Symmetry: D2
Subunit: 440 residues, 4 copies
């Protein structure tokens, strides 16, 4: 699926609706980013700028002007067309095609922005700007306001009020539209197919990075060229490290592998984690920890719905985990006292959920301790895990284990929808899948 022109227009108007009359909102594009020397990383548009434009060029600025409660218009600054620059550094939209292509009223050359922007802000009361987001943007905005401030003899005046649009825009991004949900739904499928494939390909002797290659290939073949985040393939003791991206080790018969990978599809992130035996057969000890993480996920998926919160559901997960660990002798004592002592923390130190959207760790206000009441349209991850360090003082068989199972959900009128359930997580279903693949 995709995001429509009409949808981009709706979002702009939605922002304008909340703006004060006599104001302008300034949204800047991301800079290009060096990888080494004259070589650059693949371009990634700023998420907020993308959200309002679906325009994948740098050196661009969207300006939304609200004259009053019924009058408003849009100006885009963007790079000019140029036969030289394009033949080299690749084709450009230019000013002519931009109004029609991107549904803006006017389009001006970025190279003129210092000559033109102050004229657009002259006489307004308010400017909305995300200060500190980019250095080049702050320089342009501050330069425009100084010309207005020092220009009373030329009848110029600066807006005295600057407001951060991020709280407003991020509150919008927090609630996904039907179109957005459809896109994320497809990101979930693509990402899941990748994890299914990783499970099917995995053999002892393969290196962790080989599963990374299989996943990225799968993303690509469905049209999601880039991952939403750096892929994790943590086998054995590497599963205990949360930001493990080296993915440099041989995968050994007997170990578990934790794979956290997500595609980026039309800008929107998938985010799945599956953990499984490298040899296709869970051991007793591996099952004992896996079952606790899986019950945490399965209960959380039953619970998540409008009315509850991440905090509340996290409470139930803590309970499930402390009980499970007490039964294994990894913790000793009363469950309720241990909870109050937060005794689960050496083993479960991540949160259960984060917002998901144009960024994998998406924008939006969580509330104190993530107490915010959930409403339909919110999209989030459910990702319980247990991480027992190699030197943890616990029975030997649990040492050096890292297990996480992560699914992506959307809150609905009566519950939630699981976007990533098409890749399996029940242990019998994992072993069946891997067995089935190993006859080929």
């Amino acid at each position: 699926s995709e995001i429509s022109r009409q949808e981009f227009q709706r979002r702009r108007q939605a922002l304008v609706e909340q703006m004060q009359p006599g104001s302008a909102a300034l949204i800047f594009a991301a800079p290009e980013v060096t990888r080494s020397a004259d070589s650059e990383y693949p371009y990634r548009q700023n998420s907020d700028f993308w959200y309002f434009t679906g325009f994948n060029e740098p050196e661009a600025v969207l300006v939304l002007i609200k004259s009053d409660d019924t009058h408003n218009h849009s100006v885009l600054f963007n790079r000019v067309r140029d036969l030289t620059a394009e033949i080299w550094f690749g084709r450009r939209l230019g000013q002519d095609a931009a109004p029609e292509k991107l549904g803006v009223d006017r389009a001006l050359a970025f190279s003129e922005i210092n000559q033109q922007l102050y004229q657009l802000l002259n006489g307004l009361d308010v400017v909305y700007h995300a200060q500190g987001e980019y250095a080049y943007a702050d320089v342009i905005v501050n330069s425009a306001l100084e010309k207005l401030r020092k220009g009373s003899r030329q009848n110029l005046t600066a807006p005295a009020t600057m407001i951060d649009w991020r709280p407003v825009v991020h509150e919008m991004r927090l609630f996904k539209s039907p179109e957005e949900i459809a896109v994320l739904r497809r990101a979930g499928e693509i990402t899941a197919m990748a994890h299914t494939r990783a499970m099917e390909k995995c053999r002892p002797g393969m290196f962790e990075y080989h599963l990374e290659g299989e996943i990225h290939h799968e993303f690509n073949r469905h049209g999601a060229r880039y991952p939403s985040y750096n892929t994790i393939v943590g086998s054995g003791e590497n599963g205990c490290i949360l930001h493990y991206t080296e993915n440099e080790c041989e995968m050994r018969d007997g170990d578990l592998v934790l794979i956290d990978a997500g595609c980026e599809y039309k800008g929107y992130a998938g985010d799945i984690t599956r953990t499984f035996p490298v040899n296709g057969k869970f051991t007793q000890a591996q099952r004992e920890i896996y079952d606790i993480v899986l019950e945490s996920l399965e209960t959380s998926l039953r619970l998540y719905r409008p009315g509850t919160s991440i905090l509340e559901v996290t409470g139930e997960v803590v309970r499930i985990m402390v009980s499970g660990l007490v039964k294994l002798g990894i913790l000793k004592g009363d469950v309720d006292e241990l909870i109050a002592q937060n005794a689960h923390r050496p083993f479960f130190m991540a949160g259960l959920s984060h917002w998901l959207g144009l960024d994998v760790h998406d924008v939006g206000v969580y509330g104190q301790d993530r107490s915010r009441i959930l409403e339909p349209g919110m999209v989030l991850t459910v990702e319980p895990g247990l991480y027992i360090a190699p030197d943890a003082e616990v029975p030997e068989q649990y040492r050096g284990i890292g297990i996480r199972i992560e699914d992506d959900i959307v809150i609905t009128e009566t519950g939630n929808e699981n976007l990533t359930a098409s890749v399996v997580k029940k242990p019998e279903e994992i072993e069946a899948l891997m067995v089935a693949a190993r006859k080929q």
Copy 2:
């Protein structure tokens, strides 16, 4: 293959040999680099810092101190160990293991660099620093020199002389050692296998990005996780655009596809371009242009040797190209006058060769118009191409064609060695390869 500890030591001493007595060289690591929000691109170490250390962390600084012509020592600043930071943002070397792991004399915490660096520079005559390379580095170095300058009452003195080490270091990087050549030799094989695979997989109806996925998979499976540069898959008229990386189009029966992709293997870049029919069968018109580019490459590979230069060989290529284009009626007139008129330029506007190494467009001095005499150990690309715009005023059958064929070579005592010849480029061999694959 790999780069040894001993080799890293040799390079450091080689630099020290050329430094003035009573001097210190400051080499800084690359900053981490944001992709979107809290998510980061895969880390890419600065090439020069990497060259002297094989150390893949940010917030690190190599300091090489020359007391005199026989006394010198090395200090490394690097991130301290930290159970918190690592469990999250991934394992760190720390100060204890660093001397032995990386062959430096001393290792100090990066968080102490402002308290310690000025003490290392006190009383020296010369500091070698690459000014403007990184903002954070300039701030550290300038801060260290100001403390020394303003500290005469505490018997401190700053070195009065600052020298850019880049000309010196880049002249070293220009000449590859046996180990480096072995690594690049393997980068060439990996990259070539990827291009062979792309040719074998290509069918009409596949999208350009599908061949990108096949190539990146092949890089990965041989242990080259990342490309050295953003992959180009330019089919049809997209072949006319030199920085085409969108790779977003359906590949059509009848069109050519130009694939320029390279792996990064132990830091060193492969760089191959092959152009071929999407349907496995060159047309007369496609053959007519391809044959001119291929003769240019084949002649260049015969010519490149110690004693000649990129400029001189480029001269012979211009000749080959103008003659070929005159025979097709794409140019009219006397070959020699047309050459003097530079009449080939609308169609051949890139250079023939660039240095290759830790950067795809490698460091090192070219000489005026690339006139520098070649010597053994230099590594470079040979990449003639013809690009006929869709609206070029030439016979219709040549319009909208882009063809490049690129190989990587090293200059040897008596000629050159072709690192990328294991992927085919003779047209009959391309058609045979694709035919053979199409029975499967």
Copy 3:
């Protein structure tokens, strides 16, 4: 006279009255300023910071917090006491004496401002800050807002709204209180005594700078140590240059001298200009131009009152000047057409009036073309002048003449009060004064 503690408190409350509830206003002190090497200029406090504090130290910040419509409090950041620093760079107020001395609620060390300021802004909706006023201030404020923005997990939130307090504060400064008027009244007397003295001392053969010395001495002896602006003593052709401060020439019998000097008394600027014959006797040609400037000033002093504007009075001055110049043959033609042609501009190119206060060119909004209706409490200069260039195409006797006569006034309920009329300006009174002095 002086400014009371109570008055400083009133101004703070007056600002607070206009602030939004749940807001904080940040007012920064001026940096110290190098003259050459380790030597500094005499310290000049930022005028706005001074206005609210009467505190003459750098590295100080006034923070006014409005909790709601009845609750507000003040925090001062200032330099800590230190026996070392003071014995050297001079005594300091410190935190203990500050609340009581300066009428603030709380006082904290400036060296703690980055550890404390963000805590004062946490949870507010609005911060009032003068962006771009000082680099060090912007760094402190931006640093405080980033900690709040990135600190949601520690339950911090930044104010989303930033407002420039300068329009508000400068509108306050535009209207002087009884105390302020009394201070300016005394600045006027001091400044005038200085000009009277200059006239009495002036002889041919003295250098322009000698009159500067006489003026600065007079300022000093009445307790106004520093001038409000760099003194102008433009004799002969130097009178034609508006920013003449070299004051390096011998004063010649036959020439006029234009003296523009003002004291700074308790922070408030005097600003007087008197022009007079170096030899104490006006010539016919000097009188002819002087009489036009003086009638302009005398008419302006009759006119200035509540209800009119600088623009309107400037209109009447233009009329007076064009008529005067036509009668001398310096302009030819119809007065009304010449006015419309703005034909007076080569000779009268300054404005007639500027606001006067803590800055000689004081803050406050003028309106388009200075059309703002005057109200009681506004303080301003009246300074018509004629400047005929040495090469002006006019009768020889008028070439190379510069004449200005400037007085300071305050608008009152029924007119204006002249603060500087105690130094003479009628030509007969100037000649009498100089004659009287020349018998001594």
Copy 4:
């Protein structure tokens, strides 16, 4: 006296003599400096730039180019002429008159410096630049070097070596020429006349600032418009504060007043301190401390000559002071042990001497603990003092006293010459002077 054109040329050549062949030296002018709002401090040229040019404008850059050991030339960047700018912000030299006026070969507009400077540095090996001296200069120089670095395809190359010219230039400034000595000799006379006048004018009831006014007037009347540093008039307990510049107190019968004031004459600083009874009659206790400071000064003036050092002479002063204080009972014990205990430090905590020149605290290397052997041509202050705090644990009669006596000297072939001896310092001569004045 003054500094000649020829002398400015000599200094430039002297610098060039020491420069490497194939190099350029970049010397920048001082920025203009705000006092409050649109008002500026009196302009003070950077001392080093002044030293080579005698040119008193901002936005100017001297560039000295050494082609080889016999070829060199000078380029000046300066502000262009402009009838508008000058009529307002005052006359300018421009490019036409500059070569001849200031003895440079070529002169270009400052507004072109970014278009022209890199062309002057292209192909040189060395650039001499004072990094960190001014922000605007670093921006210009770094911008010029980046164009050269990134411009190999346009056959540009940057100098790889940057050297600080300050050690070289400051070593030149350390040794004064005959002309410089003549100028300083006159600065000494002017400054001394000012101090004599202060002594003659001083009466109880006058404020400290009144003596400041008398001194500044005297400076001015001899053509030294500005002081070299902020004047100190510390009466009573204010004498104990070294950086006392408030000068705000009533001078009381019975107290001493310490006056430290210096003129700036043709750029060169005078620096004299005299301390004397406000009522013209020293008391026993005042005499007891004064006599120790005066013997320190008189012995130092006998001692200072080529061959000795500030450190060595400071040794003899410490001896004189500890003995004097022991005889008064302000210190108890063995003189030699007390010296070794540095027991004099609570009372004598300043140094004895600093270099004097274009800056009051002049440039030049002191050596460790100021051990540098003195040579003819060095100019320095001799300024012993005793400062007994109001709460010092000493006999009551010595509490709250500050006494310093400072003279300026030049080292000669056989000793020194005292530039400031024309103002008196023997106590009987002070009392005679004040008595004589008090009959008038």
